[PDB]
Amino acid sequence: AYLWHRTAFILAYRTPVVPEGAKAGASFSANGVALRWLADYDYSQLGDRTLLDV
Amino acid sequence: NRRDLRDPDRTVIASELVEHSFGVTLDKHVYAALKFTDEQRTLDIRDYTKQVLMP
């Protein structure tokens, strides 16, 4: 069990930006945290790749 | 090309674009040559167009 005051712990979040070379991605949310979604096509593997990060 | 669906190897064969060429040339010289003496031209030839040029 943990008993803490509001000032005891600190969380910080930063949403990554979608760069110039990436096809424009969406932006989702998780517990009020803004998540950067991104997709890229692998011609070599003949398939799509998605990343959702923060 | 063709490949099987759901094939674990995802390599694709590169198709290639190859133009070709040949060549056309001038090769021969077709001619008709005539020679006349002054005597033939003065006395023998009566109509130059019908006797010389048209043949």
PDB file of N, CA and C in Angstrom:
ATOM      1  N   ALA A   1       0.856  -1.171   0.000  1.00  0.00           N
ATOM      2  CA  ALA A   1       0.000   0.000   0.000  1.00  0.00           C
ATOM      3  C   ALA A   1       0.895   1.224   0.000  1.00  0.00           C
ATOM      4  N   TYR A   2       0.458   2.285  -0.662  1.00  0.00           N
ATOM      5  CA  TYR A   2       1.237   3.506  -0.773  1.00  0.00           C
ATOM      6  C   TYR A   2       0.362   4.687  -0.414  1.00  0.00           C
ATOM      7  N   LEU A   3       0.870   5.549   0.453  1.00  0.00           N
ATOM      8  CA  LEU A   3       0.175   6.760   0.856  1.00  0.00           C
ATOM      9  C   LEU A   3       1.065   7.938   0.519  1.00  0.00           C
ATOM     10  N   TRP A   4       0.609   8.798  -0.380  1.00  0.00           N
ATOM     11  CA  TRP A   4       1.478   9.860  -0.855  1.00  0.00           C
ATOM     12  C   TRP A   4       0.716  11.168  -0.974  1.00  0.00           C
ATOM     13  N   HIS A   5       1.459  12.260  -0.916  1.00  0.00           N
ATOM     14  CA  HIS A   5       0.913  13.575  -1.190  1.00  0.00           C
ATOM     15  C   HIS A   5       1.016  13.873  -2.681  1.00  0.00           C
ATOM     16  N   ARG A   6       0.192  14.818  -3.133  1.00  0.00           N
ATOM     17  CA  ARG A   6       0.159  15.195  -4.542  1.00  0.00           C
ATOM     18  C   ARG A   6       1.534  15.564  -5.078  1.00  0.00           C
ATOM     19  N   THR A   7       2.361  16.206  -4.264  1.00  0.00           N
ATOM     20  CA  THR A   7       3.655  16.711  -4.697  1.00  0.00           C
ATOM     21  C   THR A   7       4.745  15.650  -4.685  1.00  0.00           C
ATOM     22  N   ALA A   8       4.427  14.416  -4.297  1.00  0.00           N
ATOM     23  CA  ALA A   8       5.458  13.404  -4.105  1.00  0.00           C
ATOM     24  C   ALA A   8       6.031  12.920  -5.429  1.00  0.00           C
ATOM     25  N   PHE A   9       5.175  12.695  -6.422  1.00  0.00           N
ATOM     26  CA  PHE A   9       5.565  12.125  -7.704  1.00  0.00           C
ATOM     27  C   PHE A   9       5.165  13.059  -8.833  1.00  0.00           C
ATOM     28  N   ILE A  10       5.961  13.071  -9.899  1.00  0.00           N
ATOM     29  CA  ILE A  10       5.735  13.927 -11.059  1.00  0.00           C
ATOM     30  C   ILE A  10       5.833  13.085 -12.323  1.00  0.00           C
ATOM     31  N   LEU A  11       4.852  13.230 -13.212  1.00  0.00           N
ATOM     32  CA  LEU A  11       4.883  12.664 -14.555  1.00  0.00           C
ATOM     33  C   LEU A  11       4.895  13.768 -15.598  1.00  0.00           C
ATOM     34  N   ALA A  12       5.622  13.524 -16.676  1.00  0.00           N
ATOM     35  CA  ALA A  12       5.760  14.447 -17.783  1.00  0.00           C
ATOM     36  C   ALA A  12       5.586  13.673 -19.072  1.00  0.00           C
ATOM     37  N   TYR A  13       4.838  14.245 -20.006  1.00  0.00           N
ATOM     38  CA  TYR A  13       4.595  13.596 -21.280  1.00  0.00           C
ATOM     39  C   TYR A  13       4.899  14.576 -22.395  1.00  0.00           C
ATOM     40  N   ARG A  14       5.355  14.047 -23.523  1.00  0.00           N
ATOM     41  CA  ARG A  14       5.620  14.836 -24.713  1.00  0.00           C
ATOM     42  C   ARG A  14       5.241  14.006 -25.926  1.00  0.00           C
ATOM     43  N   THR A  15       4.378  14.540 -26.751  1.00  0.00           N
ATOM     44  CA  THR A  15       4.020  13.832 -27.967  1.00  0.00           C
ATOM     45  C   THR A  15       5.082  14.083 -29.026  1.00  0.00           C
ATOM     46  N   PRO A  16       5.647  13.039 -29.625  1.00  0.00           N
ATOM     47  CA  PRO A  16       6.588  13.250 -30.721  1.00  0.00           C
ATOM     48  C   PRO A  16       5.893  13.898 -31.906  1.00  0.00           C
ATOM     49  N   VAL A  17       6.657  14.617 -32.690  1.00  0.00           N
ATOM     50  CA  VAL A  17       6.129  15.249 -33.892  1.00  0.00           C
ATOM     51  C   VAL A  17       6.280  14.278 -35.050  1.00  0.00           C
ATOM     52  N   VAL A  18       5.385  14.386 -36.025  1.00  0.00           N
ATOM     53  CA  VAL A  18       5.509  13.608 -37.251  1.00  0.00           C
ATOM     54  C   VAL A  18       6.453  14.373 -38.169  1.00  0.00           C
ATOM     55  N   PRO A  19       7.540  13.766 -38.627  1.00  0.00           N
ATOM     56  CA  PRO A  19       8.535  14.505 -39.404  1.00  0.00           C
ATOM     57  C   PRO A  19       8.055  14.792 -40.821  1.00  0.00           C
ATOM     58  N   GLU A  20       8.913  15.492 -41.561  1.00  0.00           N
ATOM     59  CA  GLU A  20       8.592  15.870 -42.931  1.00  0.00           C
ATOM     60  C   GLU A  20       8.474  14.651 -43.832  1.00  0.00           C
ATOM     61  N   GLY A  21       9.339  13.662 -43.645  1.00  0.00           N
ATOM     62  CA  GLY A  21       9.367  12.541 -44.558  1.00  0.00           C
ATOM     63  C   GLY A  21       8.320  11.492 -44.318  1.00  0.00           C
ATOM     64  N   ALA A  22       7.623  11.565 -43.195  1.00  0.00           N
ATOM     65  CA  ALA A  22       6.589  10.606 -42.863  1.00  0.00           C
ATOM     66  C   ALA A  22       5.253  11.060 -43.423  1.00  0.00           C
ATOM     67  N   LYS A  23       4.521  10.119 -44.010  1.00  0.00           N
ATOM     68  CA  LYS A  23       3.135  10.377 -44.362  1.00  0.00           C
ATOM     69  C   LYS A  23       2.369  10.787 -43.112  1.00  0.00           C
ATOM     70  N   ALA A  24       1.582  11.856 -43.235  1.00  0.00           N
ATOM     71  CA  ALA A  24       0.952  12.471 -42.076  1.00  0.00           C
ATOM     72  C   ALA A  24       0.134  11.451 -41.299  1.00  0.00           C
ATOM     73  N   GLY A  25       0.354  11.405 -39.985  1.00  0.00           N
ATOM     74  CA  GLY A  25      -0.287  10.444 -39.123  1.00  0.00           C
ATOM     75  C   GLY A  25      -1.350  11.072 -38.239  1.00  0.00           C
ATOM     76  N   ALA A  26      -2.057  10.203 -37.533  1.00  0.00           N
ATOM     77  CA  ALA A  26      -3.126  10.608 -36.640  1.00  0.00           C
ATOM     78  C   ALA A  26      -2.555  10.945 -35.267  1.00  0.00           C
ATOM     79  N   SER A  27      -3.439  11.147 -34.296  1.00  0.00           N
ATOM     80  CA  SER A  27      -3.038  11.413 -32.923  1.00  0.00           C
ATOM     81  C   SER A  27      -4.126  10.864 -32.021  1.00  0.00           C
ATOM     82  N   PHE A  28      -3.771   9.918 -31.165  1.00  0.00           N
ATOM     83  CA  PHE A  28      -4.738   9.252 -30.309  1.00  0.00           C
ATOM     84  C   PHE A  28      -4.533   9.702 -28.870  1.00  0.00           C
ATOM     85  N   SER A  29      -5.327   9.150 -27.961  1.00  0.00           N
ATOM     86  CA  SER A  29      -5.234   9.529 -26.561  1.00  0.00           C
ATOM     87  C   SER A  29      -5.342   8.297 -25.676  1.00  0.00           C
ATOM     88  N   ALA A  30      -4.606   8.320 -24.570  1.00  0.00           N
ATOM     89  CA  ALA A  30      -4.570   7.230 -23.601  1.00  0.00           C
ATOM     90  C   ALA A  30      -4.490   7.843 -22.211  1.00  0.00           C
ATOM     91  N   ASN A  31      -5.593   7.785 -21.466  1.00  0.00           N
ATOM     92  CA  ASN A  31      -5.686   8.382 -20.131  1.00  0.00           C
ATOM     93  C   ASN A  31      -5.361   9.871 -20.163  1.00  0.00           C
ATOM     94  N   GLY A  32      -5.781  10.550 -21.224  1.00  0.00           N
ATOM     95  CA  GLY A  32      -5.468  11.954 -21.380  1.00  0.00           C
ATOM     96  C   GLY A  32      -4.083  12.244 -21.900  1.00  0.00           C
ATOM     97  N   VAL A  33      -3.361  11.230 -22.361  1.00  0.00           N
ATOM     98  CA  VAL A  33      -2.009  11.375 -22.884  1.00  0.00           C
ATOM     99  C   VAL A  33      -2.094  11.326 -24.401  1.00  0.00           C
ATOM    100  N   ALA A  34      -1.535  12.328 -25.070  1.00  0.00           N
ATOM    101  CA  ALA A  34      -1.604  12.392 -26.520  1.00  0.00           C
ATOM    102  C   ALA A  34      -0.497  11.550 -27.135  1.00  0.00           C
ATOM    103  N   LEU A  35      -0.891  10.594 -27.964  1.00  0.00           N
ATOM    104  CA  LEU A  35      -0.003   9.614 -28.562  1.00  0.00           C
ATOM    105  C   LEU A  35       0.127   9.900 -30.046  1.00  0.00           C
ATOM    106  N   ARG A  36       1.353   9.835 -30.551  1.00  0.00           N
ATOM    107  CA  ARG A  36       1.617  10.062 -31.963  1.00  0.00           C
ATOM    108  C   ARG A  36       1.547   8.736 -32.701  1.00  0.00           C
ATOM    109  N   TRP A  37       0.640   8.651 -33.668  1.00  0.00           N
ATOM    110  CA  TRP A  37       0.529   7.498 -34.542  1.00  0.00           C
ATOM    111  C   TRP A  37       1.176   7.797 -35.882  1.00  0.00           C
ATOM    112  N   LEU A  38       1.735   6.759 -36.487  1.00  0.00           N
ATOM    113  CA  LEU A  38       2.551   6.907 -37.676  1.00  0.00           C
ATOM    114  C   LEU A  38       2.530   5.591 -38.435  1.00  0.00           C
ATOM    115  N   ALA A  39       2.579   5.661 -39.760  1.00  0.00           N
ATOM    116  CA  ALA A  39       2.545   4.472 -40.599  1.00  0.00           C
ATOM    117  C   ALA A  39       3.554   4.605 -41.727  1.00  0.00           C
ATOM    118  N   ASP A  40       4.192   3.494 -42.080  1.00  0.00           N
ATOM    119  CA  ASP A  40       5.216   3.449 -43.111  1.00  0.00           C
ATOM    120  C   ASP A  40       5.133   2.117 -43.841  1.00  0.00           C
ATOM    121  N   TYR A  41       5.265   2.147 -45.159  1.00  0.00           N
ATOM    122  CA  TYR A  41       5.139   0.943 -45.965  1.00  0.00           C
ATOM    123  C   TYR A  41       6.512   0.338 -46.226  1.00  0.00           C
ATOM    124  N   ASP A  42       6.665  -0.944 -45.910  1.00  0.00           N
ATOM    125  CA  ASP A  42       7.878  -1.703 -46.179  1.00  0.00           C
ATOM    126  C   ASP A  42       7.686  -2.409 -47.512  1.00  0.00           C
ATOM    127  N   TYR A  43       8.260  -1.827 -48.567  1.00  0.00           N
ATOM    128  CA  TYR A  43       8.266  -2.477 -49.870  1.00  0.00           C
ATOM    129  C   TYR A  43       9.038  -3.783 -49.818  1.00  0.00           C
ATOM    130  N   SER A  44      10.136  -3.811 -49.062  1.00  0.00           N
ATOM    131  CA  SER A  44      10.948  -5.015 -48.979  1.00  0.00           C
ATOM    132  C   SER A  44      10.167  -6.167 -48.365  1.00  0.00           C
ATOM    133  N   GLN A  45       9.427  -5.900 -47.299  1.00  0.00           N
ATOM    134  CA  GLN A  45       8.593  -6.904 -46.660  1.00  0.00           C
ATOM    135  C   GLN A  45       7.187  -6.953 -47.226  1.00  0.00           C
ATOM    136  N   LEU A  46       6.858  -6.071 -48.167  1.00  0.00           N
ATOM    137  CA  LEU A  46       5.529  -6.007 -48.770  1.00  0.00           C
ATOM    138  C   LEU A  46       4.443  -5.905 -47.711  1.00  0.00           C
ATOM    139  N   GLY A  47       4.585  -4.940 -46.807  1.00  0.00           N
ATOM    140  CA  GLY A  47       3.577  -4.777 -45.780  1.00  0.00           C
ATOM    141  C   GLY A  47       3.706  -3.453 -45.067  1.00  0.00           C
ATOM    142  N   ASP A  48       2.630  -3.063 -44.408  1.00  0.00           N
ATOM    143  CA  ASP A  48       2.596  -1.810 -43.678  1.00  0.00           C
ATOM    144  C   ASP A  48       3.113  -1.995 -42.260  1.00  0.00           C
ATOM    145  N   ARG A  49       3.586  -0.895 -41.686  1.00  0.00           N
ATOM    146  CA  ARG A  49       4.114  -0.829 -40.336  1.00  0.00           C
ATOM    147  C   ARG A  49       3.487   0.370 -39.652  1.00  0.00           C
ATOM    148  N   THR A  50       3.008   0.190 -38.434  1.00  0.00           N
ATOM    149  CA  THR A  50       2.439   1.280 -37.663  1.00  0.00           C
ATOM    150  C   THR A  50       3.151   1.390 -36.326  1.00  0.00           C
ATOM    151  N   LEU A  51       3.362   2.626 -35.892  1.00  0.00           N
ATOM    152  CA  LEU A  51       3.970   2.911 -34.605  1.00  0.00           C
ATOM    153  C   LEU A  51       3.098   3.913 -33.873  1.00  0.00           C
ATOM    154  N   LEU A  52       2.873   3.676 -32.586  1.00  0.00           N
ATOM    155  CA  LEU A  52       2.097   4.577 -31.745  1.00  0.00           C
ATOM    156  C   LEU A  52       2.909   4.849 -30.490  1.00  0.00           C
ATOM    157  N   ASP A  53       3.367   6.086 -30.313  1.00  0.00           N
ATOM    158  CA  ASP A  53       4.426   6.340 -29.349  1.00  0.00           C
ATOM    159  C   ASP A  53       4.257   7.671 -28.626  1.00  0.00           C
ATOM    160  N   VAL A  54       5.030   7.815 -27.544  1.00  0.00           N
ATOM    161  CA  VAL A  54       5.013   8.998 -26.688  1.00  0.00           C
ATOM    162  C   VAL A  54       6.316   9.031 -25.894  1.00  0.00           C
TER     163      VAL A  54
ATOM    164  N   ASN B   1       5.765 -11.206 -63.156  1.00  0.00           N
ATOM    165  CA  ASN B   1       6.060 -12.401 -62.393  1.00  0.00           C
ATOM    166  C   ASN B   1       4.861 -12.762 -61.534  1.00  0.00           C
ATOM    167  N   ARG B   2       4.966 -13.893 -60.853  1.00  0.00           N
ATOM    168  CA  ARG B   2       3.921 -14.344 -59.956  1.00  0.00           C
ATOM    169  C   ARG B   2       4.568 -14.961 -58.728  1.00  0.00           C
ATOM    170  N   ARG B   3       3.871 -14.869 -57.601  1.00  0.00           N
ATOM    171  CA  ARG B   3       4.336 -15.466 -56.364  1.00  0.00           C
ATOM    172  C   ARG B   3       3.134 -15.966 -55.589  1.00  0.00           C
ATOM    173  N   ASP B   4       3.390 -16.881 -54.666  1.00  0.00           N
ATOM    174  CA  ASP B   4       2.328 -17.450 -53.858  1.00  0.00           C
ATOM    175  C   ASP B   4       1.891 -16.473 -52.780  1.00  0.00           C
ATOM    176  N   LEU B   5       0.589 -16.438 -52.520  1.00  0.00           N
ATOM    177  CA  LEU B   5       0.073 -15.615 -51.440  1.00  0.00           C
ATOM    178  C   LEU B   5       0.581 -16.108 -50.093  1.00  0.00           C
ATOM    179  N   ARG B   6       0.766 -15.164 -49.171  1.00  0.00           N
ATOM    180  CA  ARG B   6       1.194 -15.462 -47.807  1.00  0.00           C
ATOM    181  C   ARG B   6       2.534 -16.184 -47.783  1.00  0.00           C
ATOM    182  N   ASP B   7       3.365 -15.902 -48.772  1.00  0.00           N
ATOM    183  CA  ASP B   7       4.689 -16.492 -48.850  1.00  0.00           C
ATOM    184  C   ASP B   7       5.601 -15.818 -47.834  1.00  0.00           C
ATOM    185  N   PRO B   8       6.250 -16.572 -46.946  1.00  0.00           N
ATOM    186  CA  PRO B   8       7.084 -15.938 -45.915  1.00  0.00           C
ATOM    187  C   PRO B   8       8.249 -15.128 -46.460  1.00  0.00           C
ATOM    188  N   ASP B   9       8.699 -15.374 -47.687  1.00  0.00           N
ATOM    189  CA  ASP B   9       9.710 -14.529 -48.305  1.00  0.00           C
ATOM    190  C   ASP B   9       9.021 -13.510 -49.202  1.00  0.00           C
ATOM    191  N   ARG B  10       9.370 -12.240 -49.015  1.00  0.00           N
ATOM    192  CA  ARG B  10       8.669 -11.129 -49.639  1.00  0.00           C
ATOM    193  C   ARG B  10       9.470 -10.487 -50.761  1.00  0.00           C
ATOM    194  N   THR B  11      10.487 -11.173 -51.264  1.00  0.00           N
ATOM    195  CA  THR B  11      11.264 -10.647 -52.371  1.00  0.00           C
ATOM    196  C   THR B  11      10.445 -10.669 -53.654  1.00  0.00           C
ATOM    197  N   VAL B  12      10.621  -9.629 -54.462  1.00  0.00           N
ATOM    198  CA  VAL B  12       9.959  -9.501 -55.752  1.00  0.00           C
ATOM    199  C   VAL B  12      11.023  -9.377 -56.830  1.00  0.00           C
ATOM    200  N   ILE B  13      10.781 -10.031 -57.954  1.00  0.00           N
ATOM    201  CA  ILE B  13      11.725 -10.038 -59.060  1.00  0.00           C
ATOM    202  C   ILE B  13      11.594  -8.736 -59.835  1.00  0.00           C
ATOM    203  N   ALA B  14      12.716  -8.059 -60.042  1.00  0.00           N
ATOM    204  CA  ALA B  14      12.715  -6.785 -60.742  1.00  0.00           C
ATOM    205  C   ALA B  14      12.518  -7.023 -62.229  1.00  0.00           C
ATOM    206  N   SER B  15      11.497  -6.396 -62.796  1.00  0.00           N
ATOM    207  CA  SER B  15      11.304  -6.413 -64.233  1.00  0.00           C
ATOM    208  C   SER B  15      12.193  -5.352 -64.864  1.00  0.00           C
ATOM    209  N   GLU B  16      12.597  -5.591 -66.104  1.00  0.00           N
ATOM    210  CA  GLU B  16      13.619  -4.771 -66.729  1.00  0.00           C
ATOM    211  C   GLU B  16      13.141  -4.292 -68.091  1.00  0.00           C
ATOM    212  N   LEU B  17      13.482  -3.053 -68.426  1.00  0.00           N
ATOM    213  CA  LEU B  17      13.007  -2.393 -69.636  1.00  0.00           C
ATOM    214  C   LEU B  17      14.184  -2.195 -70.574  1.00  0.00           C
ATOM    215  N   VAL B  18      14.211  -2.960 -71.659  1.00  0.00           N
ATOM    216  CA  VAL B  18      15.327  -2.966 -72.596  1.00  0.00           C
ATOM    217  C   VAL B  18      14.806  -2.588 -73.974  1.00  0.00           C
ATOM    218  N   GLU B  19      15.114  -1.372 -74.415  1.00  0.00           N
ATOM    219  CA  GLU B  19      14.859  -0.962 -75.788  1.00  0.00           C
ATOM    220  C   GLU B  19      15.901  -1.579 -76.698  1.00  0.00           C
ATOM    221  N   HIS B  20      15.534  -1.774 -77.958  1.00  0.00           N
ATOM    222  CA  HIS B  20      16.467  -2.298 -78.939  1.00  0.00           C
ATOM    223  C   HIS B  20      16.568  -1.323 -80.099  1.00  0.00           C
ATOM    224  N   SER B  21      17.470  -1.602 -81.031  1.00  0.00           N
ATOM    225  CA  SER B  21      17.650  -0.700 -82.157  1.00  0.00           C
ATOM    226  C   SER B  21      18.262  -1.441 -83.331  1.00  0.00           C
ATOM    227  N   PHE B  22      17.913  -0.996 -84.533  1.00  0.00           N
ATOM    228  CA  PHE B  22      18.643  -1.394 -85.731  1.00  0.00           C
ATOM    229  C   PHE B  22      18.978  -0.139 -86.514  1.00  0.00           C
ATOM    230  N   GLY B  23      19.510  -0.303 -87.718  1.00  0.00           N
ATOM    231  CA  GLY B  23      19.975   0.818 -88.509  1.00  0.00           C
ATOM    232  C   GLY B  23      19.654   0.664 -89.981  1.00  0.00           C
ATOM    233  N   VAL B  24      19.310   1.782 -90.612  1.00  0.00           N
ATOM    234  CA  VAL B  24      18.974   1.842 -92.028  1.00  0.00           C
ATOM    235  C   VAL B  24      19.971   2.767 -92.715  1.00  0.00           C
ATOM    236  N   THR B  25      20.399   2.393 -93.917  1.00  0.00           N
ATOM    237  CA  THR B  25      21.497   3.061 -94.595  1.00  0.00           C
ATOM    238  C   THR B  25      21.181   3.226 -96.077  1.00  0.00           C
ATOM    239  N   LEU B  26      21.787   4.239 -96.695  1.00  0.00           N
ATOM    240  CA  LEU B  26      21.872   4.329 -98.145  1.00  0.00           C
ATOM    241  C   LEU B  26      23.048   3.492 -98.627  1.00  0.00           C
ATOM    242  N   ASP B  27      22.843   2.732 -99.684  1.00  0.00           N
ATOM    243  CA  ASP B  27      23.898   1.806-100.076  1.00  0.00           C
ATOM    244  C   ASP B  27      24.287   1.877-101.546  1.00  0.00           C
ATOM    245  N   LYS B  28      23.342   2.096-102.451  1.00  0.00           N
ATOM    246  CA  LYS B  28      23.618   2.001-103.877  1.00  0.00           C
ATOM    247  C   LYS B  28      23.443   3.334-104.582  1.00  0.00           C
ATOM    248  N   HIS B  29      23.930   3.356-105.814  1.00  0.00           N
ATOM    249  CA  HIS B  29      23.864   4.515-106.693  1.00  0.00           C
ATOM    250  C   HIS B  29      23.389   3.996-108.047  1.00  0.00           C
ATOM    251  N   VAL B  30      22.132   4.258-108.384  1.00  0.00           N
ATOM    252  CA  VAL B  30      21.556   3.794-109.639  1.00  0.00           C
ATOM    253  C   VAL B  30      21.691   4.904-110.667  1.00  0.00           C
ATOM    254  N   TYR B  31      22.270   4.584-111.818  1.00  0.00           N
ATOM    255  CA  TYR B  31      22.539   5.581-112.837  1.00  0.00           C
ATOM    256  C   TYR B  31      22.340   4.992-114.222  1.00  0.00           C
ATOM    257  N   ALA B  32      22.033   5.878-115.159  1.00  0.00           N
ATOM    258  CA  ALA B  32      22.083   5.606-116.589  1.00  0.00           C
ATOM    259  C   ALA B  32      22.986   6.657-117.205  1.00  0.00           C
ATOM    260  N   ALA B  33      24.019   6.215-117.905  1.00  0.00           N
ATOM    261  CA  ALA B  33      24.987   7.102-118.522  1.00  0.00           C
ATOM    262  C   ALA B  33      24.979   6.901-120.026  1.00  0.00           C
ATOM    263  N   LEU B  34      25.060   8.004-120.756  1.00  0.00           N
ATOM    264  CA  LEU B  34      25.138   7.967-122.204  1.00  0.00           C
ATOM    265  C   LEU B  34      26.262   8.885-122.639  1.00  0.00           C
ATOM    266  N   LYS B  35      26.875   8.564-123.768  1.00  0.00           N
ATOM    267  CA  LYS B  35      27.857   9.446-124.371  1.00  0.00           C
ATOM    268  C   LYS B  35      27.628   9.482-125.869  1.00  0.00           C
ATOM    269  N   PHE B  36      27.722  10.676-126.436  1.00  0.00           N
ATOM    270  CA  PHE B  36      27.533  10.877-127.863  1.00  0.00           C
ATOM    271  C   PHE B  36      28.707  11.650-128.424  1.00  0.00           C
ATOM    272  N   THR B  37      29.061  11.351-129.665  1.00  0.00           N
ATOM    273  CA  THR B  37      30.023  12.167-130.375  1.00  0.00           C
ATOM    274  C   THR B  37      29.327  13.383-130.975  1.00  0.00           C
ATOM    275  N   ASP B  38      30.128  14.370-131.373  1.00  0.00           N
ATOM    276  CA  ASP B  38      29.571  15.565-131.995  1.00  0.00           C
ATOM    277  C   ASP B  38      28.851  15.225-133.289  1.00  0.00           C
ATOM    278  N   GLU B  39      29.352  14.231-134.020  1.00  0.00           N
ATOM    279  CA  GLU B  39      28.684  13.794-135.238  1.00  0.00           C
ATOM    280  C   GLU B  39      27.325  13.183-134.933  1.00  0.00           C
ATOM    281  N   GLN B  40      27.256  12.320-133.920  1.00  0.00           N
ATOM    282  CA  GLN B  40      25.982  11.716-133.553  1.00  0.00           C
ATOM    283  C   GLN B  40      24.990  12.763-133.073  1.00  0.00           C
ATOM    284  N   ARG B  41      25.444  13.694-132.241  1.00  0.00           N
ATOM    285  CA  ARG B  41      24.553  14.722-131.724  1.00  0.00           C
ATOM    286  C   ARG B  41      24.061  15.641-132.835  1.00  0.00           C
ATOM    287  N   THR B  42      24.935  15.971-133.788  1.00  0.00           N
ATOM    288  CA  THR B  42      24.574  16.889-134.865  1.00  0.00           C
ATOM    289  C   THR B  42      23.677  16.234-135.907  1.00  0.00           C
ATOM    290  N   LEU B  43      23.973  14.998-136.294  1.00  0.00           N
ATOM    291  CA  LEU B  43      23.306  14.343-137.410  1.00  0.00           C
ATOM    292  C   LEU B  43      22.352  13.242-136.980  1.00  0.00           C
ATOM    293  N   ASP B  44      22.765  12.386-136.048  1.00  0.00           N
ATOM    294  CA  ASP B  44      21.970  11.206-135.724  1.00  0.00           C
ATOM    295  C   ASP B  44      20.772  11.549-134.850  1.00  0.00           C
ATOM    296  N   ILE B  45      20.971  12.376-133.832  1.00  0.00           N
ATOM    297  CA  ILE B  45      19.899  12.703-132.897  1.00  0.00           C
ATOM    298  C   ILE B  45      19.004  13.756-133.536  1.00  0.00           C
ATOM    299  N   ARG B  46      17.715  13.448-133.649  1.00  0.00           N
ATOM    300  CA  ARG B  46      16.734  14.377-134.197  1.00  0.00           C
ATOM    301  C   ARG B  46      15.790  14.936-133.146  1.00  0.00           C
ATOM    302  N   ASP B  47      15.420  14.144-132.140  1.00  0.00           N
ATOM    303  CA  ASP B  47      14.644  14.620-130.999  1.00  0.00           C
ATOM    304  C   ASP B  47      15.310  14.104-129.734  1.00  0.00           C
ATOM    305  N   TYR B  48      15.984  14.997-129.010  1.00  0.00           N
ATOM    306  CA  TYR B  48      16.763  14.586-127.849  1.00  0.00           C
ATOM    307  C   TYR B  48      15.880  14.003-126.755  1.00  0.00           C
ATOM    308  N   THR B  49      14.692  14.569-126.554  1.00  0.00           N
ATOM    309  CA  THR B  49      13.831  14.099-125.477  1.00  0.00           C
ATOM    310  C   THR B  49      13.321  12.690-125.741  1.00  0.00           C
ATOM    311  N   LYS B  50      12.837  12.430-126.953  1.00  0.00           N
ATOM    312  CA  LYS B  50      12.279  11.124-127.276  1.00  0.00           C
ATOM    313  C   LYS B  50      13.354  10.077-127.525  1.00  0.00           C
ATOM    314  N   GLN B  51      14.510  10.485-128.047  1.00  0.00           N
ATOM    315  CA  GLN B  51      15.561   9.551-128.414  1.00  0.00           C
ATOM    316  C   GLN B  51      16.544   9.260-127.295  1.00  0.00           C
ATOM    317  N   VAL B  52      16.788  10.209-126.396  1.00  0.00           N
ATOM    318  CA  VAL B  52      17.822  10.048-125.383  1.00  0.00           C
ATOM    319  C   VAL B  52      17.207  10.025-123.993  1.00  0.00           C
ATOM    320  N   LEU B  53      16.485  11.085-123.637  1.00  0.00           N
ATOM    321  CA  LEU B  53      16.092  11.281-122.245  1.00  0.00           C
ATOM    322  C   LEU B  53      15.034  10.280-121.805  1.00  0.00           C
ATOM    323  N   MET B  54      13.999  10.075-122.614  1.00  0.00           N
ATOM    324  CA  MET B  54      12.947   9.143-122.212  1.00  0.00           C
ATOM    325  C   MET B  54      13.428   7.704-122.101  1.00  0.00           C
ATOM    326  N   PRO B  55      14.191   7.147-123.050  1.00  0.00           N
ATOM    327  CA  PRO B  55      14.772   5.820-122.802  1.00  0.00           C
ATOM    328  C   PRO B  55      15.659   5.777-121.577  1.00  0.00           C
TER     329      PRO B  55
END
